[PDB]
Design a protein around this ligand. Structure first.
Ligand code: FVQ
Length: 158
């Protein structure tokens, strides 16, 4: 089991950390959602499906910077919504193929009444998402830590 991002930076077997840079809608109105879709950004596969089935959760999602200040959030995991920042680990997605399968995560961030102006700065950390991988075979329990950065400013109109 290992993962890779859409621009090809990898986290190998056993886990680790990696930075992910994402384009964001440049303008978002108070009350509307800024959608951050990581399923186009993060892909994983099982290295031994003949024998091992892999289980993958979103263990923790954390908000930083402009996102923690200026937005209210939820996270969708495999189509089901939870509070963001997270208050529990999600149920597990099954990885049973060597095919690259997206990690089914998306953030829905709504600017709050006070947001107005530059609400997220280019280059800033907006989130840290911890993918947790176990299996039905041994004691492996690894963390793949994804640091999510904005590629551009997000403006909330006044
Ligand atoms: O994707 C499956 C497995 O790939 C990796 O393991 C590959 C292996 C093996 C193996 C080979 C022969 C006998 N038993 C296990 C690990 O990332 C492990 O955590 C994971 O469950």
């Amino acid at each position: 089991f290992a993962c890779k991002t859409a621009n090809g930076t990898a986290i190998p077997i056993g886990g680790g950390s990696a930075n992910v840079y994402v384009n964001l809608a440049p303008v978002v109105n108070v009350g509307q959602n800024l959608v951050v879709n990581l399923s186009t950004q993060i892909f994983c596969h099982n290295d031994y499906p003949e024998t091992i089935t892999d289980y993958v959760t979103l263990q923790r999602g954390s908000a930083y910077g402009g996102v923690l200040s200026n937005f209210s959030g939820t996270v969708k995991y495999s189509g089901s919504s939870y509070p963001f920042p997270t208050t529990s680990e999600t149920p597990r997605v099954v990885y049973n193929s060597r095919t690259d399968k997206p990690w089914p995560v998306a953030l829905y961030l709504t600017p709050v009444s006070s947001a107005g102006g530059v609400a997220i700065k280019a280059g800033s950390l907006i989130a840290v998402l911890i993918l947790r991988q176990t299996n039905n075979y041994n004691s492996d329990d690894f963390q793949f830590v994804w640091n999510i950065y904005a590629n551009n400013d997000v403006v909330v109109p006044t």
